Amino acid sequence: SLALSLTADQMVSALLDAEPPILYSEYDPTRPFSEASMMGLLTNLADRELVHMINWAKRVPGFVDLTLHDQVHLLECAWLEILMIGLVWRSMEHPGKLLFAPNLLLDRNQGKCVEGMVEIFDMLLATSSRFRMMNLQGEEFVCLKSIILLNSGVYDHIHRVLDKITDTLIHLMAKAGLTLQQQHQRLAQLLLILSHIRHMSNKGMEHLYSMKCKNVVPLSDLLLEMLDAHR
């Protein structure tokens, strides 16, 4: 497995080069305040991002070494977490706002018009703020995102790759001049946030399910199959 033979810098480069682009929403000048319009835009966005996520995953060292079935399982388990961490990353520079896309900046005032959504919005915003206050770096972000891919469905190869990513995170913090003490504290802080991201994905998944039930907004076959995997 090539992953294990990469240096820290090579692992970072691999991950930086694998990054999926930042996608846009429809270009209508309308700010969604309805369940229908907001869910319309978020599902279409997620739909298109999923295809990029899939080809990103294939470029995460160690991922392609897994059987196809395992690759499937990991993505089914992690996809919303991955979308969400990307969301809070790009939302960092926009305090109080969620940047689902460059032309789709939503505030909590819009999430409060869809039943039981404002809660998750607030969690996303707090996570974004947390990343902002930590001065989260792009190189750290991509390590964290890959960790999510490999960890969330992981229930020995995966474990060794995960160790390698940990080495890579530490490498980056050391390269940024942090002391050994700051290094292990920062590692812990970042990793604890993954538990919150997991929590938000699970609540989000419940929301997606209620939409599948309540209908109104048609869902892509892909989204349905993803949702179906969490049930």
Binding site: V51, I54, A57, K58, L68, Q71, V72, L75, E76, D221, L222, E225, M226
Partner: peptide, 10 residues
């Protein structure tokens, strides 16, 4: 058979 299964193939 899943769409995911197809997309994950080159």
């Amino acid at each position: 058979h899943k769409i995911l299964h197809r997309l994950l193939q080159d």
